[PDB]
Design a protein around this ligand. Structure first.
Ligand SMILES: Nc1ncnc2c1ncn2[C@@H]1O[C@H](COP(=O)(O)OP(=O)(O)NP(=O)(O)O)[C@@H](O)[C@H]1O
Lengths: 560, 578
DNA sequence: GCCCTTTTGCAA
DNA sequence: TTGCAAAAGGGC
């Protein structure tokens, strides 16, 4: 209820205003202290500012020689707190430096910095109450305010809550050394969003096989286990090429009713049912590559729909698929001229090949251009998982349904990169096509993003630049700010930063966002696991230190 | 009418003169404060100078220990406002640093900086009044001993402001701009996304349209925000502004979603929207324009390297002569049909002396039979028809428009010369071909503009978004336009959001600058290097993310950079409506 | 990483 | 017989 110290000086140091505070022997003897990085209230001219404690140093006050006095007391062996109160009362001062960050105005908005420097005689500094801190953070907890690991510097009641307005339609970056909590942070945010706001969809690109089932003691549990614990049914769609191994695994950990929580789907299709899909994939593979699809590929890409009415034209497409190595289902009848062959049988295949046009004959001749499709082909599938995912995420059925689509990238081997690029392109094109009718309203979860946001001409770069218009959020983790382009870093809205050991990383971070210049020293020298610095635009344009929650504790606590 | 404080020191710090001001306890207790960046009047030796407040700090005055005094007062709960006047009067001081920018002489001439250093005993500092600020914002550099121009009409662009501080806004002090500044010159609109770029771009375009009705515009609308109000805000677009001002028959909107855009135009402008905007398609019918198809197929190979094939190179140069020979043109039409383009229903091709209808399969088969059962390069073109398949994306039957030629006529036509048209291009609807078509259109517009040098000036303004994407390439048409377009009367207004990515050659020769909040350090550093006057606002621009707050600088005769809160289009329309 | 150089088929 | 495409290795 009273000022902590006395303000004795103030100035403008660069783009910020700073002031000097002095703590007296009485206040120090009452146990009053100020922690570095602590948030305080500054009253000046009838206006309230938020301030941060930056520095602290000892300096003599008045006419005194603290060194001589203390050395003499030590030499003569006098207990300074019991024999010489007046000697103890002339050296027990302490100095602090406080920077003004801005002030809260009108409807919770933040006015940054200031043009008015406060005179010393009329400036006061106050300890901030939990109600004030709660208002500061607010205008399903994910973390709570903390200062380092000091006792008394923890505020379990001051929390930052998850809210779809914070994440959907906006870009979030998750940085930190390996082993410090990026994946746990992501999973806690996603579980809270799924539990509290069930109309938000997620597209998780799982490259390490950890976001569905995770039983080893090296990470937090998976989303399937979290959803089973919280009683969330029928919201996970898992795509994989190991649909039998994963089905076996799910039954040991989710029990006999695992199908109520997870739906396993294959990443394989029958290309004798989707020749247009085969041709489109072969055509797009080269655009995603350097450049210049061939003329015989553009011709097919544009005219295969026309060809479908001509059995002679379609016979050459099926022959190209069969010659590239794709296995047909037993009893597949191909009609040529005035005869029907069974390509599944070697004798009929040879007969038709010997017995065998708008550009389809060139496609048949250059059949080895389809061999890569054999990484996706499986006879008897007839699914088109690309379209299946498209209506999972952007289907008109939703208008708010909630769909967590998890892609098991490793199972695809060396086709995963091409598959990811193609799927992202399709989803973004559909989202653009639906503009003005419905919003996408889903979040792309992207780990090790430095492999996706490198080239400016990439679909992921384009999504990061233009997803806010169409309602697509992005949440990307990289372990190192220096791995991300500065153009993306500067345009990112939300930041969640754990410990970074390198000076270059913190320099890049503060070069991207100025307010991050006040925590670089803490980041460099405090390796604490699960301790985050969070920054949100435009309502919390300043860094706040949060202690993040374990997913196990969150699950055990949300049952109440 | 009294000095704010007392001047205690003066010197020169580099290319500028500076002085030190002290605010005493009596002034500080009356509420007198100086804001950072505020402009003040400095009187010295009978001359008046303009100064700006740069810094502020606390320093002891005389013999006194403020720390000990204030600590002793604090430990006794002494209120240094009603209890210890003597203790308060010994510590209540404050220091400020003020730079001398120049002075106003004669009839508004601005003399920059000064060779005289004011002595400290007779120098006085005064808070500037609104009338003085109004007269100061109108001063500019002039030759010498000459009379002021007495130029054309001027319009309010924004009003003076000093951040977000209370008492820092001066709604009666407005910066008036002559729209001719934007005609034939380069304008840079830097800033973060969502901070006012679109509003000020629309204000500039509306002022140009109202003041100079003979100047045309070519807007490459990437975000689709210049025609109507987007479904995220309610700021009127160019079409609604032109309806409000009663400007008729000037907007030509090219798009591939004519039905949706016509529905929106109806719902927003009423039932007479056709009197204000004309909607045209972006798709061509290549049976009406086989020369366009041949040119596209020929130039696609060239722009990617390697010599084009002989048959394509021959067709490019001889298709106009082939038009008089139906037997030779039938092969071109057959090549298009084989490539797969869809003909308009009822199309007829005359081969030999027989008339066929390629829109029907039986007739098409008959024509194919007759064609094979050396007419220049036409037969070689027909044999290799698969070179035209890529046109299926750009083709639509029954158009007979050729937007590429229509836009060139609109912008550089003799009949349409005068009362310049406002062409707006809906780039998103083009999909992947947007950049290709934009570059082609700009090239074929620059060529015609250079050709017409002597008979008629180009006289149109190019509106480009995310300009760092196109201005990076020094071999590009947009870089060439930025460098050379002034000679042919072609202006450029570009917004980037990342000035560091724009070459210093372009930055140094830009005339108009409007800068909003910039998050990155490199962007601000490049700005300071490019223009010296932007050195006094670098700290503000980096740490003050304020929406609608801009720093403006118009070359070459503006003294210093002016911070403004810019007027909204809604209010500008009312102002022009009175 | 990118820009020549070759064998091979399809045509007319 | 030669021009044109298309895939692939080699030189820079
Ligand atoms: N908030 C937390 N509180 C306590 N321990 C935590 C917290 N977050 C993470 N941990 C511990 O850190 C371990 C690894 O967490 P993890 O989420 O995998 O970090 P990470 O950033 O993803 N490492 P990596 O993905 O390899 O770069 C967990 O198994 C926990 O023991």
């Amino acid at each position: 209820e009273s000022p902590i110290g006395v303000v004795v000086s103030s100035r403008r140091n660069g783009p910020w205003a700073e002031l000097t505070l002095v703590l007296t022997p009485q206040e120090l003897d009452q146990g009053k202290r100020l922690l570095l990085g602590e948030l305080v209230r500054v009253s000046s001219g009838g206006k309230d500012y938020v301030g941060m404690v930056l520095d602290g140093y000892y300096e003599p006050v008045g006419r005194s020689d603290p060194t001589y006095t203390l050395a003499l007391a030590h030499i003569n062996q006098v207990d300074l707190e019991k024999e010489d109160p007046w000697a103890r009362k002339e050296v027990n001062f302490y100095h602090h430096r406080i920077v003004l960050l801005g002030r809260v105005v009108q409807g919770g908005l933040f006015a940054p910095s200031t043009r008015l420097l406060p005179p010393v005689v009329e400036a006061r500094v106050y300890r901030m109450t939990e109600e004030e801190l709660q208002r500061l953070l607010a205008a399903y907890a994910f973390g709570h305010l903390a200062y380092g690991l000091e006792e008394g510097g923890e505020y379990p009641e001051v929390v930052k809550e998850v809210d779809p307005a914070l994440f959907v339609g906006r870009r979030t970056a998750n940085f930190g050394k390996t082993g410090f909590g990026k994946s746990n942070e992501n999973k806690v945010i996603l579980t809270l969003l799924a539990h509290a706001f069930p109309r938000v969809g997620m597209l998780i690109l799982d490259q390490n096989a950890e976001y569905l089932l995770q039983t080893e003691a090296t990470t937090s549990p998976g989303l399937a286990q979290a959803f089973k614990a919280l009683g969330i049914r029928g919201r996970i769609r898992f795509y994989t090429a190991r649909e039998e191994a994963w089905a076996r695994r799910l039954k040991e950990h989710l029990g006999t009713e695992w199908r109520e929580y997870v739906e396993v789907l294959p990443l394989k299709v029958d290309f004798y049912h989707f020749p247009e899909l085969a041709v489109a994939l072969a055509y797009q593979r080269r655009r995603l590559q350097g450049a210049e699809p061939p003329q015989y590929l553009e011709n097919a890409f544009y005219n295969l729909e026309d060809w479908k009415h001509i059995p002679d034209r379609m016979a050459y497409v099926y022959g190209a698929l069969r010659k590239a190595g794709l296995t047909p289902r037993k009893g597949l009848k191909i009609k040529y001229k005035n005869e029907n062959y069974d390509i599944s049988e070697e004798k009929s295949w040879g007969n038709l090949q010997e017995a065998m046009k708008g550009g389809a004959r060139e496609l048949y001749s250059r059949a080895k251009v389809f061999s890569f499709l054999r990484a996706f082909h499986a006879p008897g599938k007839e699914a088109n998982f690309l379209e299946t995912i498209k209506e999972d995420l952007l289907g008109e059925k939703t208008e708010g349904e909630g769909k967590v689509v998890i892609l098991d990238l490793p199972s695809l081997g060396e086709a995963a990169d091409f598959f990811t690029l193609r799927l992202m392109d399709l989803l973004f094109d559909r989202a653009v096509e639906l503009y003005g009718k419905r919003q996408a309203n889903f979040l792309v979860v992207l780990e090790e993003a430095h492999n996706f946001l490198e080239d400016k001409a990439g679909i992921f770069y384009r999504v990061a630049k233009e997803g806010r218009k169409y309602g697509i959020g992005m949440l990307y983790s990289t372990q190192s700010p220096a791995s991300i382009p500065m153009e993306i870093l500067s345009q990112t809205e939300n930041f969640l930063v754990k410990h970074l050991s390198s000076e270059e990383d913190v320099k890049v971070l503060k070069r991207a966002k100025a307010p991050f210049a006040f925590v670089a020293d803490f980041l460099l020298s405090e390796p604490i696991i699960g301790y985050s610095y969070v920054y949100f635009e435009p309502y919390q344009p300043f860094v706040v230190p949060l202690r993040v929650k374990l997913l196990e504790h969150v699950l055990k606590s949300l049952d109440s």
